[PDB]
Amino acid sequence: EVPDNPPNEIYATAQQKLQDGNWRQAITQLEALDNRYPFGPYSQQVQLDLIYAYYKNADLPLAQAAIDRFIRLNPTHPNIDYVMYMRGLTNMALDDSALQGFFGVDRSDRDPQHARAAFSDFSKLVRGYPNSQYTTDATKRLVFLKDRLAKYEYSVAEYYTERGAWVAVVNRVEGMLRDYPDTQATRDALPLMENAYRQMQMNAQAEKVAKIIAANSS
């Protein structure tokens, strides 16, 4: 429902229907340029406001679709850092972005199958682009998303402490254990695998994991 214009005009309709606020109009002329004019040298910049304005009506993964439209079609560009940062940001808000947790219960049990992939994106941003504007903020994400999977796994470690596969207690701890040496969740599940040891009468191996706890009291 949009006709053809001069190729420098549809930017403004992309720019200014972005300035409308009713979010069903912004993409409408954002997309209206690169269909009639994909041959402009600025069509990858149209993708940058596209991945931007895709978020607005809870219509997220076209951003990730337009994230990869930057990647494969266009070999040489420094703005992949934005594309890599918006990659995990698209990948994150599929997990926990609803307002149903408004009453005091958060959402780490809600499975981060794509915020699994958000960790993949933010790890490649901090290794692909060092001084880009998003490296620091993604590093903040890489701290919790590690732990966001951990308490998820610790819930299973609690669930395995609940149901009673005490071997599967320690592995849910061991899956949390061997990857990262930083979480406090690593400290507190460390007696539970050893409580699993204590219920499996591996009290010495419990104590050996309590020996791990012992110097970690800091």
User: CB under 8 A: which stretch of 14-22, 61-69, 70-78 binds another protein?
Assistant: 14-22
Among candidate residues 128, 113, 122, 114, the one with its CA nearest the CA of residue 140: 122
* 42 forms part of the interface with another protein (CB under 8 A): no
Piece of the chain touching another protein by CB under 8 A; list 61-69, 70-78, 203-211: 203-211
61 binds another protein (CB under 8 A): no
Query: Which residue, 68 or 137, has its beta carbon nearer to another protein?
Result: 137
Using an 8 Å Cβ cutoff, are 135 and 123 in contact? Answer: no
In the complex, what is the shortest distance from the CB of residue 71 to another protein, in angstroms, rounded to a whole number?
19
141 to 25, 28, 107, 149, 205: CA distances (angstroms): 31, 32, 16, 12, 34
Task: Find the binding residues for another protein in span 147-176 (CB under 8 A).
Answer: 147, 152, 155-156, 158-160, 162-168, 170-172, 174-175
Beta carbon nearer to another protein, 71 or 167: 167
**134 contributes a contact to another protein by CB under 8 A:** yes
Count the Cβ atoms, other than its own, within 10 Å of residue 114.
19
* Token couple for 8: 């420098």
Cα distance between residue 194 and residue 177, in whole Å: 13
- The smaller minimum CB distance to another protein, of residues 13 and 63, is found at 63
Among 16, 38, 71, 77, binds another protein (CB under 8 A): 38
Report which of 109, 108, 60 is spatially closest to residue 88, judged by C-alpha positions. Answer: 60
